[PDB]
């Protein structure tokens, strides 16, 4: 249980993804040289986890292995303003029992970390995806001209109203909990 600072006060409401930048270099490590540095953006729940994500992708993308290189640094990135709602696009590859797939997904959230967490839960529930399998190709905070999904564009209007049609009874604290009460609740 280690929180990143930009996570909510209630741990419940969001997953423990954080967004990392990791960068490393070919091991020989020649001093005065101007090294090729390999840098990548990973989403993980740890520094360790991030390192893994890093290396996996890196050994797939290029010749390098870990005994062949060194980790220069791992730096968590944060979201600018948690005051506004943004529409995020994400581009994925994941692995389904048959084959591998490229998906584009959109979520309306306050954080790119939130965008990701929601992405994972969704991908589990609807697609039975395994986290380890998921590869996020590219992520963009979306400009309105660019938002393509109906359940996304669905929420743009000021005239938005939800009645709350059914209120399921939920006592305020536990101190108030009773199995059986002397009269029936209401919905509304």
């Amino acid at each position: 249980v280690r929180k990143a600072a930009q996570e909510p006060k209630d741990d419940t409401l969001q997953m423990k993804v954080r967004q990392y930048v990791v960068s490393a270099a070919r091991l020989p490590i020649e001093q005065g040289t101007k090294p090729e540095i390999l840098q990548m953006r990973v989403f993980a729940r740890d520094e360790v986890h991030a390192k893994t994500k890093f290396w996996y992708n890196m050994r797939k993308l290029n010749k390098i292995k870990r005994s062949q290189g060194r980790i220069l640094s791992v730096n968590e990135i944060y979201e600018k303003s948690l005051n506004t709602v943004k529409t995020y696009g994400i581009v994925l590859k994941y692995q389904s029992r048959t084959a591998i797939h490229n998906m584009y997904k959109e979520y309306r959230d306050v954080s790119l970390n939130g965008a990701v967490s929601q992405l994972i839960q969704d991908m589990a529930g609807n697609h039975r995806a395994q986290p380890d399998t998921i590869q996020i190709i590219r992520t963009a905070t979306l400009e309105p001209k660019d938002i393509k999904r109906p359940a996304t564009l669905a929420m743009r209007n000021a005239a938005l109203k939800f009645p709350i049609v059914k209120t399921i009874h939920r006592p305020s604290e536990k101190k108030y909990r009773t199995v059986y009460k002397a009269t029936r609740p209401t919905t509304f």
Binding site: P35, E36, K60, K93, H101, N102, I136
Partner: protein
């Protein structure tokens, strides 16, 4: 296995290496061997006499006797959870000198030299070799190559 005979299952071990057919290899004829040297033992298929049992091919023995056509060597075989000394006699053909001591002597002499000189200056020199060690702190100024995970594509 239904058959047990001195050469059983000797097929590819003893076949001469590619394009080795009929190589006489005069060098082995000339190699000098001494009672205490370490020999590596390697069979050649053209020379049938003084052939060791396949088990001993590629083993490292210690020389023990020297005969006119053959070097007596010493190897050990694990048998029923114990080691058993075996005195081999190899014809010159199937024997070659092992570098396992050569390395040692070369190293030692150089090292000893270093230590003697240091003893001259009051500096104790140590010859102990340390294995790979955790990397020292570093500064890095370089060009950043930013990679992104590729989309999947099928090549048919």
């Amino acid at each position: 296995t239904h058959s047990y005979g001195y050469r059983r299952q000797t097929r590819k071990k003893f076949a001469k290496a590619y394009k080795t057919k009929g190589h006489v290899r005069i060098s082995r004829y000339l190699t000098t061997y001494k009672v205490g040297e370490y020999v590596d033992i390697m069979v050649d298929g053209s020379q049938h006499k003084g052939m060791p049992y396949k088990l001993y091919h590629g083993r490292t023995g210690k020389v023990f006797n020297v005969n006119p056509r053959s070097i007596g060597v010493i190897v050990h075989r694990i048998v029923n959870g114990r080691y058993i000394e075996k005195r081999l006699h190899v014809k010159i053909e199937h024997v070659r000198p092992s570098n396992v001591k050569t390395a040692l002597s070369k190293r030692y002499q150089a090292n000893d030299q270093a230590k003697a000189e240091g003893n001259k200056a009051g500096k104790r020199v140590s010859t102990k070799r340390n294995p790979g060690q955790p990397l020292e702190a570093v500064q890095v100024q370089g060009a950043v190559n930013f990679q992104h995970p590729k989309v999947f594509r099928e090549i048919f």
